[model samples]
Target: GTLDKARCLAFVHQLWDKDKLKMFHHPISAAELPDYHKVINYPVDLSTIRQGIESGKYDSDADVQNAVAQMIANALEYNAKGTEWHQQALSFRSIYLDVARQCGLSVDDDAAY
Candidate 1:
């Protein structure tokens, strides 16, 4: 466990050093401390997410595929609505879908929202 934790922390540090992570930033006030120090600095939470995926917490491979489809559906729906967060959500989803594609994951390009 310790070794795994170390490796995870090392990875986080490496990403930080490479300027690949935007979540970690210096906060200007105490109110931002939680996000800056806890969420950004923590690698264990990310490890937990990875462990959940590996442990079938989200069901089988087919379930993950369905979930990805649902995510695309939601992204499209959000984009169509043109709400305050629509562009932001679409941008985030675009990057997510791009990464998924790069990882050899198939996504339905013609799926309707």
Candidate 2:
């Protein structure tokens, strides 16, 4: 059943925080537009977690355990040589957390702070 196609598209556009009522000069250009616009404004401070853990700035036993588990998982998934694996594990931590948060998951870097 084909309902109001314009209204459905407007609903989706509203969800994406776009100008739902704004009429485009070119209908083709409007059709080519995506649902939303996203920017990578996240600041990734690599080695921050490792440095914090080393400097005794973590909270709860679970936090330490989770960090260790993440490192182990990365190491197992990517078997590399020497410092490369260590670096990769560290780098992937931020990427993993970002993905998790994007998917509406809970990820705490520092449990207390």
Candidate 3:
């Protein structure tokens, strides 16, 4: 009933497939986006999440929730509030939270990780 590898992978896939902008689909290249690294302590993408899920990097539901939260928090941190990117990050948070809750996974994202 809990998040096994299959359900975890499916969760990530749901995010990936619904992401039309593809903003969080891949890693943000530090080369291209200078200062991004300086600001974000951890950088994660949907692809990375997929890899982690496949590799069993998430030993607990909290592990998976934290990863997704980090990814959203990075965007929320880097982008100025009241801006497009910031708003997009908020949207992603809702999508992720909604689905995760549907799967019975309690998340700390409401407090922004």
Please name the candidate that would achieve the greatest TM-score relative to the true structure: 3
Per residue, candidate 1 scores C-alpha lDDT tens digits across 58-96 of 544334433433433443443446754455445544554
Better of 1 and 3 by TM-score: 3
Candidate 1 lDDT score at position 102: 46
Q: Rank candidates by lDDT, best first.
A: 3, 1, 2
Best-first order by TM-score: 3, 1, 2
- Candidates' C-alpha lDDT: 0.39, 0.37, 0.79
Q: What is the TM-score of each candidate against the true structure?
A: 0.35, 0.27, 0.83
Model 1 regions lying over 4 Å from their true place: 1-48, 60-89
Model 2 scores a C-alpha lDDT of 0.37
Between candidates 1 and 2, name the one with more favorable lDDT. 1
Candidate 1 lDDT: 0.39
Per-residue accuracy of model 3 over 1-113 as CA lDDT, tens digit each = 24477667777777777667787899999788989989888999989988887887778766777788899889988999998788888898768877777666666654645
The deviation in Å at residue 82 for candidate 2 is 6.5
Off by over 4 Å in 2: 1-68, 72-82
